[PDB]
Amino acid sequence: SELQLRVRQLVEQVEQIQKEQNYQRWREERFRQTSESTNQRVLWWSILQTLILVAIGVWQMRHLKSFFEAKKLV
Amino acid sequence: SELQLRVRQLVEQVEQIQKEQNYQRWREERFRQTSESTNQRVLWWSILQTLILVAIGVWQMRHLKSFFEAKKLV
Amino acid sequence: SELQLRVRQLVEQVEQIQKEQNYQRWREERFRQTSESTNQRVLWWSILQTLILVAIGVWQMRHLKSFFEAKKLV
Amino acid sequence: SELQLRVRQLVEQVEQIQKEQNYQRWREERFRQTSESTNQRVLWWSILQTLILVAIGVWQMRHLKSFFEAKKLV
Amino acid sequence: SELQLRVRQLVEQVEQIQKEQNYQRWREERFRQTSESTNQRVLWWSILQTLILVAIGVWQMRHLKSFFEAKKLV
Amino acid sequence: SELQLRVRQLVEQVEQIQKEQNYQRWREERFRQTSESTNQRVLWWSILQTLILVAIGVWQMRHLKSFFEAKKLV
Amino acid sequence: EIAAKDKLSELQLRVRQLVEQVEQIQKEQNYQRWREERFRQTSESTNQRVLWWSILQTLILVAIGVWQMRHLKSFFEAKKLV
Amino acid sequence: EIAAKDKLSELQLRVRQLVEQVEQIQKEQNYQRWREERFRQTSESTNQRVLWWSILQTLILVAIGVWQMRHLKSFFEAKKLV
Amino acid sequence: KLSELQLRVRQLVEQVEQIQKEQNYQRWREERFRQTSESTNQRVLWWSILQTLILVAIGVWQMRHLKSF
Amino acid sequence: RVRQLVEQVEQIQKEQNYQRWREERFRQTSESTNQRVLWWSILQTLILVAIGVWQMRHLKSFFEAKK
Amino acid sequence: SELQLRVRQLVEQVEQIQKEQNYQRWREERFRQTSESTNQRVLWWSILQTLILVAIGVWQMRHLKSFFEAKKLV
Amino acid sequence: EIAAKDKLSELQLRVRQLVEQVEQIQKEQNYQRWREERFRQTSESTNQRVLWWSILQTLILVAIGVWQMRHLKSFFEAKKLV
């Protein structure tokens, strides 16, 4: 029944294979949701940076103006 | 007979495992290429934005200097 | 014996599925670590960034304060 | 020899089990990584919330003073 | 026979470890989804709060400008 | 002979699997309890901080009103 | 002495009683704890329920801030009017 | 006789110590239970609070609306005065 | 005989679990009672807080009425 | 005899379960019923509050009457 | 004879035990229902939030109208 | 006498068995503690080349800001003498 034994072993391999298919699916999901997160991520941080830059510019401008006015009064 | 059906089943398992290997190699390629692309992409954008930040910082410095020189000639 | 040959084939197939399963695991783990790291790094940088910008704003105000004092004292 | 065959099967299973032990480690790792993320994340989220309150209060007091002066001087 | 009962014990053990691996895989999928959802939601709230404060600051600046316009007309 | 060695191997594998079952169930309850605790803690902190934001926002609403009344009685 | 030994015997009986008292405590530790896990389930449900509603109300607070601004406007459009 | 019996007494003393020590262990077990109970109590309290704590959360919008309505009413009154 | 005795032992185990079932029930009821009571007091306490907020607004427009006088 | 006794214990266990069924029912009622009172109960609370405001209004009216 | 009768009783005993087990399973189902009863209680809280408040609002409106009448008298 | 003492010893052994049960409970607590301990948040100190550059860059930006400020101050001084 050697052949049969071999067949049994093959079926054991089969179950394991199903499990690995599932694992692959999980990996795919990870890439998917992680790819979505990193896409949102990077972009949003960049946006923030832009905003901050704008803000600094504004700040500078404002204070310059203020000082000018101060000396205009002086 | 039944052993013939089991031989067909094992051939089916071999085919599915070959598909598993193809998808495994391809998906490794996806992770590796995507990870390298993401790292290079974030490096490019973020270093570019750092140089941009310093560039407009110096540009605002120069514009404060120019406005103050204009004030000197009032 | 044809049957025997097929048994051998099956064994080889099993082997292929097995060592590679280990490989897959490694890929995942390794891969995951990398991913994690990347994410973390990004996040860290962002936080360092924003907060730092806030501080910068505060110090701009501080510069006005010393400068303002100079304008008064003079 | 049947017994021996069974034993061989058992060893294959233990190897799988080997990978299963690795999976347990994986679980652990995952969990802890998540924990870390929440920790640092909740930490600087609370920190940023404190900055939210401080920034709002300080700047509202600032325009309090500015609008006070504006209505006084008109 | 002792060999047959060893075989039955081995089969029971392999079934048990297969159920165990199923449980670990499903639990990893579920809790990975939960963890990434929670982390994404919290960081999304953090970036939203940053935008909330930027919007509030600008809108109250517009508010003060509206007072300036009103006083300029009275 | 070798068969009793195989019996010892199977027994130690069963012992290791029982240890893995204990660790798996224990770590499962760590995930469950930790997830519930994290959700409860973030809910607590979030509700506390939103109540803080609204309450102190109203508080300097009242303080702005009080300062305006004080200016009226100048 | 003899009397003391008798007392010791009485004490032994008391320790038997003590042993009985332990077991009960162990029982308390089991099933009760499982029901504590059910209480935790309830808590979890509640958490799920508030992992968004609170945010809506935060947005609500932003709106409140704007309401405050409006009220302030009213207040300052009053002092000028005297 | 004598000395041997003294040794026996020593053994008895050891037993007494075990009874004492054991009792202390039991006390410790009790401590590890009361704390747990407290935690459970807290959880139940929390549930109630959530509904009612939750009620306070749901009192933060409606109330605001009501205030606004009152303001409107005041405005109407002003119109009546003018 | 022996087998039967073992079965009896199993029954005893079931009765221990049976006791546990009773315990579930009682736990539930107890919990419920306590919970309800405390809960009641709490949402009423908060009604009072809300009342204060509303009451203060009433005071704010009594003032308006005074201005109208 | 012994077997009869075993049967009896089994029966007892079943009975315990049924006692618990009743308990469960009670619990359900408690959960709903009392909470419904939190219904009725808070209606009463609202009423109390309302009364308070009415009283306040009356006071205001008195002040109006005293100019 | 008698002994045999006792054996029969024992089998009946076993049947009863089985029934007890069934009952236990049904009680577990009841527990599931109990777990979902909490959600029904939350629905009751939602109803409390959405009808009594409405009533209050209506009430307010009506009595505000009464105040208007009073104002007309005054 | 002797025999009675032997019986007492047996009782003590039973008590010790109860103590062992308590020890098992303690072990469970220890297992809970094992499901913890270890380290905390990981600290960056590797790869230095890229990560280091990033941090460095941030710092540089800050420094640049400061430099600008200094320059501005200098300008102010110049015109203060003007």
Numbering used by the authors:
A (entry chain H), B (entry chain I), C (entry chain G), D (entry chain E), E (entry chain D), F (entry chain F), ...: 162 to 235
G (entry chain B), H (entry chain A), L (entry chain C): 154 to 235
I (entry chain J): 160 to 228
J (entry chain K): 167 to 233
Please give sentences taken from the publication describing this entry:
TMED9 is a member of the TMED family of cargo receptors that facilitate the bidirectional transport of membrane proteins at the endoplasmic reticulum (ER)–Golgi interface via anterograde COPII and retrograde COPI vesicles. In addition, all TMEDs share a conserved domain architecture with luminal Golgi-dynamics (GOLD) and coiled-coil (CC) domains and a single TM domain. Sorting signals for COPI (dilysine motif, KK) and COPII (diphenylalanine motif, FF) coatomer proteins are contained in the cytosolic tail of TMED9. Here, we report cryo–electron microscopy (cryo-EM) structures of full-length TMED9 in octameric and dodecameric forms.
An unexpected feature of the TMED9 oligomers is an intrinsic symmetry mismatch between the CC and TM domains. In the homo-dodecamer, the TM domain was formed by three tetramers, but the CC domain was formed by four trimers. In contrast to the symmetry of the TM domain, the CC domain formed obligate trimeric coiled coils, as was also predicted by MultiCoil. The experiment identified a number of PIPs, with PIP (36:2) containing two oleic acyl chains as the most prominent PIP species. PIP (36:2) fits well with the cryo-EM density at both the headgroup and the acyl chains. The location of the PIP molecules suggests that they may facilitate TM oligomerization. The PIP headgroup between the TM tetramers is within hydrogen bonding distance to the R223 and H224 side chains from two of the four subunits at the tetramer-tetramer interface; these interactions could further stabilize octameric, dodecameric, or higher-order TMED9 complexes. In addition, several hydrogen bonds may bridge the CC trimers to stabilize the oligomeric assemblies, such as those from E163, Q165, E173, Q177, K180, E181, N183, R186, R191, Q194, T195, Q201, R202, and W205. We have detected previously undescribed oligomeric forms of TMED9, including octameric, and dodecameric structures. These and, by extension, additional higher-order self-oligomerizing TMED9 structures, are stabilized by intrinsic symmetry mismatch between the TM and CC domains. Thus, not only can TMED9 oligomers recruit COPI but they may also exhibit enhanced interaction with COPI through increased avidity.
